[PDB]
Design a protein around this ligand. Structure first.
Ligand SMILES: C=C1O[C@H](O[C@H]2[C@H](O)[C@@H](O)[C@H](O)O[C@@H]2CO)[C@H](O)[C@@H](O)[C@@H]1N[C@H]1C=C(C=O)C(=O)[C@H](O)[C@H]1O
Ligand code: CA
Ligand code: CL
Length: 448
């Protein structure tokens, strides 16, 4: 069953539609978070998508027909679409949009200067001691919408409802911390049905505005997860993760959206160098394996492009699906959602969704850990530099299983493509995991 979504960052609508059919659907990913599909400022940088001009569906990702085509094709494949929705602001300065519209002096095709809060700047110090400025002033000069206005609320809700009519199933509410929770409650009252909604709120503690304020309007991004996971995997002991989640002070599991990294923090925005990303290779594989095996939050796998150290640069100048050639894994699109350890982690999460408990936790007091999900699955990670050969207890049926991180079960269930793990008659496994490696097995990848 579906348990994990993916952020196809800067992927165009044609690439996403093909990816849904060829990979995401077959592999069991629940949904795709796409880049803002509305009209935005021209320019090659990735951040131009976060400066709206209007709500017309003509963006760098493609036009309206291509967007609709993507929603239909993904839906037929069993994959939902979550739209990155800008509820806090409009573009800064003046210029021209991707659909031909002009704007300037807080004057847009759909908003007048009177539909915005009076200009003021959000200073870094405001985050810790002035909620009024955090929510009414401008985020790096972006025109701050008067979200308490009935006209503004109606206009954003009409956009959200139009997207739902096309078939969009969820929404990421961008920059939610900058909008009073009460304004979001009023906005939601105008939204049809009950789509999936997750709100971006960066809260590591000590903020004037807390993540907990948004729990009643939808899921909330738990940024402590990304940071603490990265910090533990790099500078701490994996043994500490035995009570990861609410035990560490995170929000309720059922309210959280978690990730190893997102488009902002992999670039140093809202996250330090301890955040683990595709650049870290095997370290990234292991961090993802932990997140996907661990029963906390609703995870989203990151799918990036090699930005070659340029934190402002837009994506590759070549599509992912390029004339029958997949532009993945090298210096263009990274396609982490296709990395064997990550796709295997997703398969494990999908197949252990009937048991959300962490059972039989074992560790060597440091960087070797192992735990199960009852009789649905078991996993182990070795981050020491000597082989993990400990015998661990599981609740799994004895037999042969495919290590799903390195391969998969054949259609006739007679063989695996990767190494085989053996669960003894007493339920134990005699591990044999090399340094910086791991294993995961589940009840639906058992050899016959
Ligand atoms: C890029 C982000 O900037 C702000 O985040 C700040 C955190 O709120 C603050 O706690 C932390 O200390 O510092 C962060 C800045 O470095 C916004 O709050 C946050 O919303 C924003 N991220 C999203 C907003 C955009 C504007 O539309 C986009 O450019 C980003 O890519 C969004 O993910
Ligand atoms: Ca605001
Ligand atoms: Cl996010």
């Amino acid at each position: 069953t579906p348990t994990t979504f993916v952020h196809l960052f800067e992927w165009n609508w044609q690439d996403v539609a093909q990816e849904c059919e060829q990979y995401l659907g077959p592999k069991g990913y629940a949904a795709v978070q796409v880049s803002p599909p509305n009209e935005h400022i021209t320019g090659s940088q990735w951040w131009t998508r976060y400066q709206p001009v209007s709500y017309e569906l003509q963006s760098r990702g493609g036009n309206r027909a291509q967007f609709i085509d993507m929603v239909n094709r993904c839906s037929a494949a069993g994959v939902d679409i979550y739209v990155d929705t800008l509820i806090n602001h409009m573009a800064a300065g003046s210029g021209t949009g991707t659909a031909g519209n002009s704007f300037g002096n807080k004057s847009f095709p759909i908003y007048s200067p009177q539909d915005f809060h009076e200009s003021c700047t959000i200073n870094n110090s405001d985050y810790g001691n002035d909620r009024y400025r955090v929510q009414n002033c401008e985020l790096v000069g972006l025109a701050d919408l008067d979200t308490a206005s009935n006209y503004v609320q109606n206009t954003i809700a009409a956009y959200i409802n139009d997207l739902q009519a096309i078939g969009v199933k969820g929404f990421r509410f961008d920059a939610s911390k900058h909008v009073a929770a009460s304004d979001i409650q009023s906005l939601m009252a105008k939204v049809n049905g009950s789509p999936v909604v997750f709100q971006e709120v960066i809260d590591q503690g000590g903020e004037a505005v807390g993540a907990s304020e948004y729990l009643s309007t939808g899921l909330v991004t738990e940024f402590k997860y990304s940071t603490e996971l990265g910090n533990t995997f790099r500078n701490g002991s994996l043994a500490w993760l035995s009570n990861f989640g609410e035990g560490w002070g995170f929000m309720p599991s059922s309210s959280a959206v978690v990730f190893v990294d997102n488009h902002d923090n992999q670039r140093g925005h809202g996250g330090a160098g301890n955040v683990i990303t595709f650049e870290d290779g095997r370290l990234y594989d292991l961090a993802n394996v932990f997140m996907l095996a661990y029963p906390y939050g609703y995870p989203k796998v990151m799918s990036s492009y090699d930005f070659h150290g340029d934190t402002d640069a837009g994506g590759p100048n070549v599509p992912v699906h390029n004339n029958g050639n997949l532009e993945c894994f090298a210096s263009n699109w990274k396609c982490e959602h296709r990395w064997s350890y990550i796709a295997g982690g997703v398969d494990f999460r999908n197949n252990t969704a009937d048991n959300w408990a962490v059972t039989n936790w074992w560790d060597n007091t440091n960087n070797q850990i192992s735990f199960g999900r009852g009789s649905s699955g078991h996993m182990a990670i070795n981050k020491e530099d000597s082989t993990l050969t400990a015998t661990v207890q599981t609740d799994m049926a004895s037999g042969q299983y495919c290590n799903v991180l390195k391969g998969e079960l054949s259609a006739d269930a007679k063989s695996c493509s990767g190494e085989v793990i053996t669960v003894n008659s007493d339920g134990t496994i005699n591990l044999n995991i090399g340094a910086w490696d791991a294993m995961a097995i589940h009840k639906n990848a058992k050899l016959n």
